[PDB]
Write a structure and sequence with these properties.
- Chains A, B: GO terms for molecular function: deSUMOylase activity; endopeptidase activity; SUMO-specific endopeptidase activity.
- Chains A, B: Belongs to the peptidase C48 family.
- Chains A, B: This is Sentrin-specific protease 1.
- The structure is a homodimer of 226-residue chains.
- Chain A has a 5-stranded mixed β-sheet, sandwiched between helices. In chain A, strands 1-2 form a two-stranded antiparallel sheet.
- The first copy, chain A, has one domain: 3-Layer(aba) Sandwich (Adenoviral Proteinase, Chain).
- In chain A, 37% of the residues lie in helices and 16% in strands.
- Chain A contains 7 helices and 7 strands, in the order αββααβαβββαβαα.
- In chain A, helix 1 crosses helix 7 and helix 3 runs parallel beside helix 6.
- In chain A, a hairpin with a 2-residue loop joins strand 1 and strand 2.
- The radius of gyration of chain A is 18 Å and the shape is globular.
- The two termini of chain A are 13 Å apart.
- Chain A is of the alpha/beta class.
- Chains A and B meet through loops of A and helix 4 and helix 5 of B.
């Protein structure tokens, strides 16, 4: 049971996979810009680029904030890779004007080479979780985030972070639906985050991915999550 | 039977899984350095690191060149990732001093997140083949390589590449032995490549992986393939 893409929506979708002004700005929001060229990475079995993922993640953050939903901060895709390679100092600034502790959930898209994964800080559940649609485990990435929270707590609020009851872990291959197409990895990251930010169980599989790509084109174009 | 590892060789191997100077250089060849720490990635159910894989691949390169064998160039592990993410321009230089067309076989280790796969260009067979020990399919990878050969042909030889008769393939799950242990994926890549570079059929299974790890420790230490 998934929202249908009507013939009319399919028309809005087909239209934007047409060729033409690769620069044409299709959607502008959250400081970002989605062009025809970005949107094309959603087509066929193209790899999503960062603009799509960031744009999507910000739609989830914008949707959190409606009542009943957990509140969400989405980190931009470059954040984790900058944190890992260069340390806390290189990312510390990225959070002026943001109190990372005043939200329920932090979303951290993780770019490992060609591949996408996702880490999630849930302050309600007091834990930090890694999701990889290939079933890889990334102990490190969660520790790196714990360590970041500590250094953010010290730097922003003048207090150490309380790790009591906090649990770091990777979701295993049988626990979340797995990819078959390498290029779908960014789609799994986005859709993992969709369910999680809604507190819904992750209840799709690889077969829904063609549908999800078409849908995300549509969603991005209207800045409306279905 | 696979070559036996004797009591005498077992002792070369036990000794190196000792603790001590994690930076002690055990093997130096091919501009690479294998330390005790790299070697420990072959133990247990540890994931092989890049240094091990590149070192092995270079042993295969060095073995080709003995007479009767097909000649082989192995690409470094970061090659495919760098090509995918950044395009031909970012890897063009890695082949100054190398005529990729003057060898029979090109080995391309493919790193997808935590996982290892392998692509092979065989100029005699006139085709490009993908091996994944979890049975995943990557059409795209083969095309990206065909695209690479064309760009390399133009760049190095001043001629377009002739794609006639050329075929792009993923090997199916029933065609090649599959992994059981995620940690052994790099070993599958290495061993697929061992067989292929020798023109022997891929004739092992997951049960052989413990043996293959101990043996690769021994082989790397002696810079000698059995």
């Amino acid at each position: 049971e998934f929202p249908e893409i009507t013939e009319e929506m399919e028309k809005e979708i087909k239209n934007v996979f047409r060729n033409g002004n690769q620069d044409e700005v299709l959607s502008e929001a959250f400081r970002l810009t989605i062009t025809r060229k970005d949107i094309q990475t959603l087509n066929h079995l193209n790899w999503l680029n960062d603009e799509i993922i960031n744009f999507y993640m910000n739609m989830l953050m914008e949707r959190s904030k409606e009542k009943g939903l957990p509140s969400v901060h989405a980190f931009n895709t470059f954040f984790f890779t900058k944190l890992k390679t260069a340390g806390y100092q290189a990312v510390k600034r990225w959070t002026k004007k943001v109190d990372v502790f005043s939200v329920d959930i932090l979303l951290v898209p993780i770019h490992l080479g060609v591949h996408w994964c996702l880490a999630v800080v849930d302050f309600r559940k007091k834990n930090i979780t890694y999701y990889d649609s290939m079933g890889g485990i990334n102990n490190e990435a969660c520790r790196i985030l714990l360590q970041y929270l500590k250094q953010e707590s010290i730097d922003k609020k003048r207090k150490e972070f309380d790790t009591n009851g906090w649990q770091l872990f990777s979701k295993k291959s049988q626990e979340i639906p797995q990819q078959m197409n390498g290029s779908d990895c960014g789609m799994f990251a986005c859709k993992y985050a969709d369910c999680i930010t809604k507190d819904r169980p992750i209840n799709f599989t690889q077969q829904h991915m063609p549908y999800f790509r078409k849908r995300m084109v549509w969603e991005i174009l209207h800045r409306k999550l279905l």
